[PDB]
Amino acid sequence: WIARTFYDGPEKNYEKTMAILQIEAEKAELRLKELEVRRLMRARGDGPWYQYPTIDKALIDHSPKTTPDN
Amino acid sequence: PGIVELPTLEDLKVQEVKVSSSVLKAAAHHYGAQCDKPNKEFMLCRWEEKDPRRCLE
Ligand SMILES: CCCCCCCCCCCCCCCCC[C@@H](O)O[C@H](CO[C@H](O)CCCCCCCCCCCCCCC)COP(=O)(O)OCC[N+](C)(C)C
Numbered sequence A: 001w002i003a004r005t006f007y008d009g010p011e012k013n014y015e016k017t018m019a020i021l022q023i024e025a026e027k028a029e030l031r032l033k034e035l036e037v038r039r040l041m042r043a044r045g046d047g048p049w050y051q052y053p054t055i056d057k058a059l060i061d062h063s064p065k066t067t068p069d070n
Numbered sequence B: 001p002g003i004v005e006l007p008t009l010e011d012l013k014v015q016e017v018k019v020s021s022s023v024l025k026a027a028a029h030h031y032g033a034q035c036d037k038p039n040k041e042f043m044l045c046r047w048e049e050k051d052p053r054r055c056l057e
Helices: A002-006 A010-044 B021-034 B036-049
Strands: none
Touching: B021 B036
16 A cells, blocks of 8 residues: 555656666766866867957058058 | 079160259149059059069060
8 A cells, every 4th residue: 555655666766767867877978078078178278269369450451652662 | 592683784774864853843743644554554463472683664
């Protein structure tokens, strides 16, 4: 009676643990990958992250400058 | 890094205009009216090449 009215079968907890473990393992591997990706992007700078500004080239004036040699 | 090439002294020898700036200013308007084509050729070449060594002739 107690088992019927207060508790559930082993399958529920078993498969819930399976799902929880799967989620947590994915989160762990995601964290490790994210750290490695950050290291690579900060080292090389070829990614979208850690992009530091440079001078905009639309500011350059391309016109004769009173002197042939610029 | 590299050697800067320069024309020889013979390449820079030319029959010079040896009149003073007063004479040049007196003649300037008619000089610009008459001698315009070589002057514009030289100045277009000078702003396009951006190099004195490419404009000597
Ligand atoms: C001899 C026979 C009796 C044996 C003794 C049994 C006495 C049991 C008392 C102790 C109970 C311990 C806790 C049990 C309940 C745990 C919480 C919850 O799980 O229980 C819910 C039920 O709890 C009850 O609704 C409430 C219990 C409250 C007991 C209070 C007792 C004392 C009250 C005294 C009041 C006196 C009147 C006021 C006087 C001033 C149903 O659970 P549920 O989420 O479905 O579980 C999922 C699995 N299912 C679906 C298969 C069930």
